[PDB]
Amino acid sequence: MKKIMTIFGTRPEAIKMAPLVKALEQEKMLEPIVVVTALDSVLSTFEIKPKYDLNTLSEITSKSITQLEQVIQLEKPDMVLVHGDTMTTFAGGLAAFYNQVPIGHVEAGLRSYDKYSPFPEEVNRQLVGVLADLHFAPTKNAASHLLSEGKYSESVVVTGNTAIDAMKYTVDDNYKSNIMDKYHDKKFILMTAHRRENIGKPMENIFKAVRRLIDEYTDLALVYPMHKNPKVREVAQKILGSHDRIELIEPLDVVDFHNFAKKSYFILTDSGGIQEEAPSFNKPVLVLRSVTERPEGVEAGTLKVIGTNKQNVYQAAKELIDDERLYHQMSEASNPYGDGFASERIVNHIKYYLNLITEKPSDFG
Amino acid sequence: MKKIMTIFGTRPEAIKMAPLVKALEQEKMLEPIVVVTAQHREMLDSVLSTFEIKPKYDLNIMQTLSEITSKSITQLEQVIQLEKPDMVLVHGDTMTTFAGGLAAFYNQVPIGHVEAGLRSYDKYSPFPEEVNRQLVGVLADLHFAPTKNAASHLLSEGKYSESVVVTGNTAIDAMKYTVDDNYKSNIMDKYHDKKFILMTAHRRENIGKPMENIFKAVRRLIDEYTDLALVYPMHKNPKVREVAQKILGSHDRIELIEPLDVVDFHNFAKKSYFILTDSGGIQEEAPSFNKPVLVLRSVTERPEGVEAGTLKVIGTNKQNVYQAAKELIDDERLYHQMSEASNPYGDGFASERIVNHIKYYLNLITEKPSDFG
Ligand SMILES: O=c1ccn([C@@H]2O[C@H](COP(=O)(O)OP(=O)(O)O)[C@@H](O)[C@H]2O)c(=O)[nH]1
Ligand SMILES: O=c1ccn([C@@H]2O[C@H](COP(=O)(O)OP(=O)(O)O)[C@@H](O)[C@H]2O)c(=O)[nH]1
C-alpha cells in the first residue's frame, strides 16, 4: 500500500538493512522497494531480490544522485530509507529531499565530531542528519547527539541497531565447519582489519603482537578472513604464514562469519559492525583503533579501545588471556546496541509517521 | 601569497560576493580566484562589469535539482584540483554554494562560508535554501555570520566557538559601489508626483496562488489610492509574466519592466515609498536606505530586521498583503517607525573583516578581527 524505498550500496549495509527489508515485507500496509547501488551472498541468505540494481568522491556522488533520483521519480515512494554513512546514504537522502520524499535514517546519530576521521563517513552521517525526517538512533547516546544538535524531539527515536536483528537469520547452534573442527582443541582469536587508517605500520604492529601471542600460547589459534588488498596479504603471509594454528583465509559470508564469531575465544578488529554484534555473542572485542564512535560498548564493558601500537595490542590481548574474571565480565556484559527487534520498532515508527497507526513505539533501552 | 577561490552562480550571490572579491584583490597577501557557474547568465554579467570583476573560470551549468548538483560538483572539483586553492569561499544557500563546499571538502580544502547561519528551521521553506545552508554549516571551517543572531544558531548547533565570527552582511558593502552622482531615470520622473511601491517576487511564488494573491492585493491598492504607483521589475519566466500581465497589465500608474541592474535597483529602492518583496537580499539592504519592507514570506530567517523595525513578515494571503500595505499607507507614524530604524545587518565593512579572518586563519597575521555589533 505505502511504498518504502530502501537504498543500500555495500555488503555491511546490506547485512544491516536485510532484516528491515524482511520486516517491511511481513508488514501488510508497507511495501519495500529495494535499490542496490553496489553483496549477492547477503541478498541470497536473507532471500531479497532487488527491484533496482544500479552500477573521485565527486564522481561517485554525482552519478549516485542522478540515478537514484530516476528510480525515486519512477517509483514515487512514500518514504526513502538510507543507512548509516556511505556515499550512497547521502546521495539517496539528497535525491529524496530534492523530490520532497520523507527520509528515514537507519542507524542515525553516530559521531566522531572530527570532519576528517572517518573520512568521508563523519560528514556523510552529519549531512544526512540535516535531511532526515525520522532518525532511527541505535542507542540513547546517538539520540543525545541528535537532540543536542537541535533535531526535533519527536523525530529522534531509539530503536536499537538492526545488526542484532540480522543475527536471528544467520546463527545456527548446530553450525558445522572443517576449520572449526581443526581448532576444536584450541581457543581461537577471530581477527578482521579493513580500515585505511591501519594500512602500513599499524598492520605490521598488530600482526607481530598476534604472532607473539600465538608463539607464547600453544593452545591459541587465529582465524583471519583477510581483506583482498595485495599489500596487506603479503604482510600477513610474512608474519603469520606457514603456521598450522593460523588460518589466513578469504572474507567469510555473513552466516560463516557470525557462526565463527559465536565459537571464537575473543575478537580483534577495527570493524564498526562487529562491535555492535559481539555483545550478543558474549564475545569480548579488542578494538584496533585510536578513536571510537561506539563508546556505549566501552561503557557496557563489552569492548575495549586499544589502538594499534605493537606493545598495547599484545598487552591488552595478554591481559584478556590471563585474567579470566575480566574475560568473563566482558563476555557477560549486556548489548547496549539492541535486542534483535529494531526492525519491528522502525516499521511501527514508519506506520505511525505515515498516519497508518495511532501507537508510537517506545524507545529501546 | 595564498589563493582564495570565490565560487558563486547567481546574480544575487554575485552582488554579495563582489565587494569581497574587491577586498581580496586589494589585499596584498591574498589572491582571489573567481569561479562562476552562471545559473543566472545575462544579469550576472552586468553585476560583474559594475564591480569590474573578470572570472578566471566561467562554467556552463544552467534540469532537476539533482542534475544541477551532479554537474556542479564534478566541474567545481576539476577547477579546485587545477588551481589548488588554500581556501574555497562559498556564499549563502544556493545549489552552487553546497556543490562548491562539497567538492572543496572531498579535496580537503578549508571552507569559508560567507553569510553563515541563517535559519528558518523549516526544511521546505525556503526550499532548497534552508537545507543548503544547513548542509554547508556541516562542511565549513569558518562561518562568517552576518549577525549575532545567526552566530547563535551556529553556536547552539555545536559549531566550534572560534570558527564562528560575526562580520555583518556584505550586501551593505556592495551599496558603496552602487552610488551614481549623475543618476537619472525617466520612469522615476514620470512618477515624480506619486509615491511608488517597488515590488519584486521570486518565480516559485507562482507555484499555487501566492503571486496571484499578491498582485490582486496590490492592484486593489492602486485602484483605491490615485497618488500611488507601482514599479515591478519582473523575472523573465513566461508564466510569471502572464499572471502579471493578466492582473496588473493595461493599468495607469503600474510599470511592468525587465529586471533592473543593481545600480538602478538600489537607486529605485531609495526613491520608493516602500518595498513589497519576498527577496532575502533586499531585507538586508533596505534599512540602509531607510525604507520600510513588507516581506512576502510565511517564515523568516531574518528576524533581526523585524526586531529592529524595518521589516514586517506578512505572508502571501490576499487579505493580509492588502491590509498590511493599506496600514503602511494610512498610518504615517507606523511608516516612520519602519523608516528610521538602524540596520542590524552591517556597516559596509564586512569584506575587510572577512579578509582579516582569512589571513588570521591561514597564519598570515596575529590579530583576529572583533565581532561586528
Ligand atoms: O569476513 C567477514 C567480516 C565481516 N563480516 C560482517 O560484516 C560486517 C562488518 O563489515 P566491515 O568490518 O567490513 O565494515 P564496517 O562495519 O566497519 O563498516 C559485520 O556484519 C560482520 O559480521 C562478514 O560477514 N565477513
Ligand atoms: O531587478 C532587480 C531586483 C533585485 N536586485 C538586487 O538583487 C538582490 C536580490 O535578489 P533576489 O531577490 O532575486 O534574490 P534573493 O536575495 O531572494 O535570493 C538584491 O541585492 C537586490 O538589490 C537587482 O539588482 N535588480
Numbering used by the authors:
A (entry chain A): 1 to 38, 44 to 60, 67 to 376
B (entry chain B): 1 to 62, 66 to 376
What do the authors of the reporting publication say about this deposited model?
Herein we demonstrate that MnaA functions as the previously uncharacterized 2-epimerase that interconverts UDP-GlcNAc and UDP-ManNAc, thus providing the corresponding substrates of TarO and TarA in both S. aureus and S. epidermidis. Wall teichoic acid (WTA) is an anionic glycophosphate cell wall polymer in Gram-positive bacteria that is present in roughly equal amounts to PG. WTA is synthesized using the lipid carrier bactoprenyl phosphate and a sequential series of cytosolic-exposed plasma membrane associated Tar (teichoic acid ribitol) enzymes, starting with TarO and TarA. Genetic evidence is provided demonstrating that MnaA is essential for WTA production and β-lactam resistance in MRSA and MRSE.
The MRSA COL MnaA crystal structure was solved at 1.9Å resolution. The protein crystallizes with a dimer in the asymmetric unit. The structure is closely related to that of other bacterial 2-epimerases (root-mean-square (RMS) deviation differences with E. coli MnaA in Cα positions for all atoms in a monomer between 1.40 and 2.90Å depending on the chains being compared), and a similar dimerization interface and quaternary structure is observed. While there are significant structural differences between the E. coli and S. aureus models, they are located on the protein surface, away from either the substrate binding site or the oligomerization interface. Surprisingly, there are differences between the two monomers in the S. aureus MnaA structure: the RMS. deviation in positions for all Cα is about 1.0Å. We refer in the following the structure of the ternary complex between MnaA, UDP and UDP-GlcNAc as the “closed” form, and other states of the protein, either in apo form or a binary complex with UDP, as the “opened” form, consistent with past structural characterization of the enzymes. In addition to differences in the quaternary structure, other significant local structural rearrangements distinguish the two monomers. Notably, His 205 to Gly 211 (E. coli His 213 to Gly 219, B. anthracis His 209 to Gly 215) differ significantly, but in the monomer nearer to the closed form adopts a conformer similar to the one observed in the closed form. Collectively, crystallographic results described here allow for a more refined understanding of the enzyme regulation at a structural level: a dynamic equilibrium between the opened form and an “intermediate closed” conformer of the enzyme is present in solution in apo form or in presence of UDP only. Mapping of MnaA LOF mutations isolated in MRSA COL Δcap5P into the S. aureus MnaA structure shows that all the sequence changes are in close proximity to the substrate binding site or the UDP-GlcNAc binding site, therefore rendering the enzyme inactive.
